[PDB]
Design an enzyme around this catalytic site. Structure first.
Site, short mmCIF file in Angstrom:
data_model
loop_
_atom_site.label_atom_id
_atom_site.label_comp_id
_atom_site.label_asym_id
_atom_site.label_seq_id
_atom_site.Cartn_x
_atom_site.Cartn_y
_atom_site.Cartn_z
N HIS A 165 0.86 -1.18 0.00
CA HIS A 165 0.00 0.00 0.00
C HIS A 165 0.90 1.23 0.00
O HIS A 165 2.06 1.15 0.42
CB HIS A 165 -0.90 0.07 1.24
CG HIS A 165 -1.90 -1.04 1.32
ND1 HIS A 165 -3.05 -1.04 0.57
CD2 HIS A 165 -1.92 -2.17 2.06
CE1 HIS A 165 -3.73 -2.15 0.82
NE2 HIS A 165 -3.06 -2.85 1.71
N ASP B 9 2.02 2.04 3.47
CA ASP B 9 2.94 1.03 4.00
C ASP B 9 4.40 1.35 3.77
O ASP B 9 5.25 0.85 4.51
CB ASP B 9 2.68 -0.31 3.34
CG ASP B 9 1.32 -0.80 3.61
OD1 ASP B 9 0.62 -0.08 4.38
OD2 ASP B 9 0.94 -1.84 3.04
N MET C 291 2.83 -5.94 -7.59
CA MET C 291 1.58 -5.21 -7.57
C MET C 291 1.64 -4.15 -6.47
O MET C 291 2.27 -4.36 -5.43
CB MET C 291 0.41 -6.17 -7.33
CG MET C 291 -0.93 -5.55 -6.90
SD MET C 291 -1.15 -5.26 -5.13
CE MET C 291 -1.77 -6.83 -4.53
N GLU D 272 -10.38 -5.88 -6.10
CA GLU D 272 -10.48 -6.86 -5.02
C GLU D 272 -11.89 -6.74 -4.49
O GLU D 272 -12.23 -5.69 -3.93
CB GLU D 272 -9.45 -6.58 -3.93
CG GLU D 272 -9.38 -7.60 -2.82
CD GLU D 272 -8.27 -7.30 -1.83
OE1 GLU D 272 -7.49 -6.35 -2.07
OE2 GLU D 272 -8.19 -7.96 -0.78
N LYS E 55 -15.00 -7.60 -1.88
CA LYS E 55 -15.23 -8.10 -0.53
C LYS E 55 -16.66 -7.77 -0.14
O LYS E 55 -17.14 -6.67 -0.44
CB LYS E 55 -14.23 -7.48 0.48
CG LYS E 55 -14.47 -7.88 1.92
CD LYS E 55 -13.34 -7.46 2.88
CE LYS E 55 -13.23 -8.39 4.11
NZ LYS E 55 -12.56 -7.71 5.28
N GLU F 136 -9.93 -12.79 -3.41
CA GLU F 136 -9.35 -13.23 -2.15
C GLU F 136 -10.20 -14.40 -1.64
O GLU F 136 -11.43 -14.33 -1.67
CB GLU F 136 -9.31 -12.07 -1.14
CG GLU F 136 -8.97 -12.55 0.24
CD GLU F 136 -8.47 -11.49 1.20
OE1 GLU F 136 -7.68 -10.59 0.80
OE2 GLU F 136 -8.83 -11.61 2.39
N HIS G 200 -12.71 -13.75 1.13
CA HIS G 200 -13.77 -12.79 0.84
C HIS G 200 -15.01 -13.48 0.33
O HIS G 200 -16.13 -13.16 0.77
CB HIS G 200 -13.28 -11.76 -0.14
CG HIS G 200 -12.35 -10.77 0.46
ND1 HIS G 200 -11.69 -9.81 -0.27
CD2 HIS G 200 -11.99 -10.58 1.76
CE1 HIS G 200 -10.93 -9.10 0.55
NE2 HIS G 200 -11.10 -9.55 1.78
N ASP H 7 -5.37 -13.42 -4.38
CA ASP H 7 -5.03 -13.16 -2.97
C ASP H 7 -5.40 -14.40 -2.15
O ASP H 7 -6.59 -14.72 -1.98
CB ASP H 7 -5.73 -11.91 -2.45
CG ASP H 7 -4.85 -10.63 -2.48
OD1 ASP H 7 -3.87 -10.57 -3.25
OD2 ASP H 7 -5.15 -9.68 -1.71
N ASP I 36 -13.36 -11.23 8.43
CA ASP I 36 -12.18 -11.59 7.65
C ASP I 36 -11.07 -12.03 8.59
O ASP I 36 -10.34 -11.20 9.13
CB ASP I 36 -11.74 -10.41 6.79
CG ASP I 36 -10.97 -10.85 5.55
OD1 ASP I 36 -11.20 -11.98 5.05
OD2 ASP I 36 -10.10 -10.06 5.11
N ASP J 207 -8.40 -13.78 7.75
CA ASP J 207 -7.14 -13.67 7.03
C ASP J 207 -6.14 -14.72 7.51
O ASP J 207 -4.94 -14.48 7.67
CB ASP J 207 -6.59 -12.24 7.13
CG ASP J 207 -7.18 -11.31 6.07
OD1 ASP J 207 -7.73 -11.82 5.06
OD2 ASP J 207 -7.14 -10.08 6.26
N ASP K 101 -2.43 -12.79 1.20
CA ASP K 101 -2.94 -11.67 1.98
C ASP K 101 -3.42 -12.20 3.33
O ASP K 101 -4.60 -12.10 3.67
CB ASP K 101 -4.08 -10.97 1.24
CG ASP K 101 -4.47 -9.67 1.89
OD1 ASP K 101 -3.95 -9.38 2.99
OD2 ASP K 101 -5.35 -8.96 1.33
MG LIG Z 1 -6.60 -8.49 0.13
MG LIG Z 2 -9.03 -10.17 3.60
#
Ligand SMILES: [Mg+2]
Ligand SMILES: [Mg+2]
Ligand SMILES: [Mg+2]
Ligand SMILES: [Mg+2]
Ligand SMILES: [Mg+2]
Ligand SMILES: [Mg+2]
Ligand SMILES: [Mg+2]
Ligand SMILES: [Mg+2]
Lengths: 386, 386, 386, 386
Positions: free
Chosen positions: C53, C56, C87, C180, C182, C216, C219, C244, C254, C256, C286
């Site tokens: 990001h 980030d 990416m 992406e 979600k 993802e 998701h 992802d 989520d 993850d 991810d």
């Molecule tokens: Mg993601």
């Molecule tokens: Mg996620």
């Protein structure tokens, strides 16, 4: 007017309107609130009292000097406003030390500190007047299957609760405990995930009469269940010592929405049950006013909680008062479900031929239930379309 | 070889492999099965026994003459094969008369007939050798909120169970009851929706020792819950008198898939728990072989149930036998969770300064749990990638 | 030894291993990480690269000068370790300004600040060598019905993705956009909730060739959907620009989780499809190393992800090459699904009597599908039991 | 008196009021209905018309002669009552031959029998005056991962919908196709699971103008999705050709409850959007009168559906005309969401310093959204409390 009077017994948590908006994917959008300010502004809204976490009233790491003053400031606010503190609880989730648990953490020192943190706040709720201490074991759970042996953790939860009840009995505090159950978030799966799961744990404790449940609407709607039915079973067992009201828009993250929002029809049924059952306890609101809002949208959302419950009181009372509904309930033989099945006994039921050999399953199966008529009578009452 | 021997104690229901494929949106794809044939073909597959519904063995409306013969044909089959009947139950759901309920139906005559139908099959399970009678209150629920008062229906369920236990005690049958809990389908919401909800009802009965629970994998995965945790609490209370194994691919319709399918990792954990706990009861399979299959795909799916549990027995035993895992469990202080929190007492815990004032929350919070390492050790064992 | 090499194209996010443990009920448990630290450590673990990001890598508020130093540090690390940046994406969710959305925010100045933040980081990705830019509208959505006219918001999402394609097309960058999707969290309902929903949105764009999807796993499993199926429809449409990989234990928040956990069978069918289709793109994780873990647990979770993938690569390949499986597939007529239904034409099908009049519908329906024998072959190929 | 007239365009299915009560655990509780009976009774209830499956009107196996008599009966009823047949569809799910799918079945002869069954009923709809043909692939899907290559199945779904458009385009019929998406049940996972998933599939068709969507409320709520949002994206794409109105109480089985039940607030936001967009199409109820009910309960459920809709029409209109609401919307800046984000262009936005450098991000973020005051205004407009 659907206005709240402190006779409505509406309570909020300092952390509700105080929520600064820090979610998992974002930072705070609202400033921190003062406990004193919250008690004051919630009082002009018509509330009866406020509940609190230890960490909400007394900052973590606070000396005893700072502690006594944070309390003295809070009590002067309650005294001057008239507010009540019907319930208290312990933050045993936010601090990194409570990562794997508090009462059921794999590390014994952590377990032993969780107990000491809770016993300290129990003492505070005693002197403040609280009659219920709620426990939310938010971190008591796992994300993997070998990180916790549920059988051994239920032993450490029993110990802790039976130790916390040995202290209340020794001190002579007029306190009863209430378990808040959640199925997931913050952990992947939480121990004591439903109202039933906690109701069972209680009957395995040493002094089961000191323990009860504090059910939350969205905590059961997170599992796809019917909160009104859960309140019913807990009522049926006498173990509704507290309740948490809010809104949840499906099986998803804990939204902690205002009451009435989410499943509106289930809130109509919830108010129907509590008012038919005569719930004389605090009607506590555990909502998080959305992070898109400001302090004015914070108090608007706390007034809606109260307004929505009151509108539902008027619609659920008008529904049971309606002769048309009372006839429909009789059409649906709800009166006959309160009749005992075999008050004549097993011996006489076993001799009734009309309960087997001379029973016309076919005439009885042909009998409709008239449930669709009773339900539209309810919908038109909820809508005020009568 | 992952072959089943009747020592594995694998049981199936006549209705499992017998499922003709009639779903809500479609008609049957498979012919009806004979109870005798099912016992025979399930025997060559390695099973230990078969369970049954009344309506599966004795057609509805059958005279006593027909009844005795349907039984005599079934017993000659069990005798000649060696099969067992560890569990029985009552169809109190299929017939239109059981539309609103059986034990909790609004109409008293229906309630009284449900009891008589059940007492008759109880008698049969006694003479056949069954040690558990299962009850699935599939119709005990509602689709609307005023069609059933849960409080009053839990009174009619208690009565029925306490009447069914007054009969078992009077007759002297060596039978214990097991409640199968489901949250929805066939009704919108069912009473006693979880293992916890049934575990609580039991402790409100008159002879709570005669009653236990019969949990099903997908019945709890239908609510988003962790079946292994539920088995753990029921074990922790001594109330696992029976278990139902299968597969469920999410929060959706009851798929009744073969065991191992659905959430495979949760089946690894389930076998770990039952085998660590020493479950000596029947490992019953309640699966519906898909309607796309023929009789050969029916027996293939019953052999996979048994094969999958056996492969998991070997992987879960190899996992706990691994020194690397045993070290990781110690790294994650699972040994320290079996240590009592305050065996010194409350008085001495309250005098421990090392449990509060002289406790370093910060050093303890810095301690990782090493749960990710233990979990990949499990995944590699499940996969056989060690 | 299923051990990863950069040729495996396993990438990672900087926010994945970087996650500090902050969840909605808990503080951070781990320290922030330096991108140079992450690059180097994941280069020793066998990865092909990292992703990022904007916030980030460049702290929010950073001056241009601080900006360029942060990039140059990062690039020095990339060039030294051989690790690439395949990416990039923008944080349009953490800051309070984004609390009602970025491109779909009800305020126009915020919608313009979004595109500018974005374009700023699209330049950066073109420099670092990225070929995909991902967009996740975590804040585009609502909790209320009159807070967002979705139809007008989609016109604002179209505008933005179309302004973003005009900028890339003008500057000649070898970058493509991926959405992406979600379904929920952080907002009550997120716009473009599934893979399909954005496949359709893309078709309504001016340059619909620059836009694909970043699915993802977790998701889709938060809506109870089959991730292999949705990837199949993106592979069919030709819109799978990035993937992802994570894990999820059902319809909840989520989680993850590390890839492999949650549903192993779904991961088994994703690696099958991915490796049978020739997905030449980056295999991106991810995940969120659980907050119960230290930095050694963190790096062990990234290792697990890649190991778990490579085991599944070994077992899905063995599956599709098993001669027994290739015969089971012909028995389930998966070869005939590849035959056109009506290569002869409409007029020829409508003349055919064997497709209606003279079709033996009862024989076709008596033929089994042999789907359960195939699946047990895939269960034993997954568990190393064949 | 919110009483329906044919001008309200409320239609119904013949299988809706016709449902006999057969669920997967229970037999039929109601008798079959004659289409002429349904037409007449729903014409006295205020409906505009009925809809049908092929096998709802012409029994399976019927000879051409029996076929024509059944049509002529039906038509006599339509012409007498003024009730029209606005949409038709084919049963490709009840017969065993369809157990692995119709257009996507792994056997080619079944895929051809499907198109022919279908075309046969597309002629009939052209005669009866229908303008939409709906398709629901309830059997297109799987419970196993290697039973269906979805990518190849989509090529078989494309083939069929494209052969079906070639036949309509050749015969000059004023019929358009609509896809009814559903996520699961009867199959484990159904292909084209959401409104979005089929919006994308349609774009890959040769004649993508003959194909829209038939969204069903309960279908999206079985995946935890917002039905008003999905309809918004079909309204935006221009693919809302038909709508199927019912009710659902969360992520479970398709309950097909009467419209209004389940989530009232969602129904409130659907009627808002539908009536603010000018949906001139048929308002179709695909409900299932519960099996606890007689035929009087059945007709009372169809009445409820239309009454519940019309009440919501009254309260969403009053809401959007309330001057207080029109001011709340301007305060939530829903007027500014209608302003283009960058009518000035890309080059002009990139030159703007007030969209980055000189943007006060902390002021924008301190502005509240006023979303809670708006929503309480919509809650009081729904409940008649304003
Ligand atoms: Mg993601
Ligand atoms: Mg996620
Ligand atoms: Mg909560
Ligand atoms: Mg709470
Ligand atoms: Mg079942
Ligand atoms: Mg069962
Ligand atoms: Mg439906
Ligand atoms: Mg439909």
């Amino acid at each position: 007017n659907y206005q709240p009077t402190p006779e409505d017994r509406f309570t909020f948590g300092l952390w509700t309107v105080g929520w600064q908006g820090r979610d998992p994917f974002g930072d705070a959008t609202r400033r921190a609130l003062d406990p004193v300010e919250t008690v004051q502004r919630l009082a002009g809204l018509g509330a009866h009292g406020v509940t609190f976490h230890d960490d909400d009233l007394i900052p973590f790491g606070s000396s005893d000097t700072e502690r006594e003053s944070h309390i003295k400031r809070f009590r002067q606010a309650l005294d001057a406003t008239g507010m009540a503190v019907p319930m208290a609880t312990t933050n045993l989730f936010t601090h990194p030390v409570f990562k794997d648990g508090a009462f059921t953490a794999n590390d014994r020192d952590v377990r032993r500190y969780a107990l000491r943190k809770t016993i300290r706040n129990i003492d505070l709720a005693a002197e403040l007047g609280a009659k219920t201490y709620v426990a939310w074991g938010g971190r008591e759970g796992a994300e993997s299957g070998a990180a916790k042996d549920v059988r051994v953790a239920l032993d450490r939860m029993k110990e802790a609760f039976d130790l916390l009840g040995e202290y209340v009995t020794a001190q002579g505090y007029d306190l009863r405990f209430a378990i808040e159950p959640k199925p997931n978030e913050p952990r992947g799966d939480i121990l004591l995930p439903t109202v039933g799961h906690a109701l069972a744990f209680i009957e395995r404790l040493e002094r089961p009469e000191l323990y009860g449940v504090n059910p939350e609407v969205g905590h059961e709607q997170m599992a796809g269940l019917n909160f009104p039915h859960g309140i019913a079973q807990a009522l049926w067992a006498g173990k509704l010592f507290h309740i948490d009201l809010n809104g949840q828009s499906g099986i998803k993250y804990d939204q902690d929405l205002r009451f009435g929002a989410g499943d509106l029809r289930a809130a109509f049924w919830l108010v129907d049950l509590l008012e038919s059952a005569g719930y004389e306890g605090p009607k506590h609101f555990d909502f998080k006013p959305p992070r898109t809002e400001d302090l004015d949208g914070v108090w608007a959302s706390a007034a809606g909680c109260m307004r929505n419950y009151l509108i539902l009181k008027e619609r659920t009372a008008a529904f049971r008062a309606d002769p048309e509904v009372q006839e429909a309930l009789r059409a649906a033989r709800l009166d006959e479900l309160a009749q005992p099945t075999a008050g004549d006994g097993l011996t006489a039921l076993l001799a009734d031929r009309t309960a087997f050999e001379d029973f016309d399953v076919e005439a009885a199966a042909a009998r409709g239930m008239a449930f669709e008529q009773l339900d539209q009578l309810a919908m038109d009452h909820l809508l005020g379309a009568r």
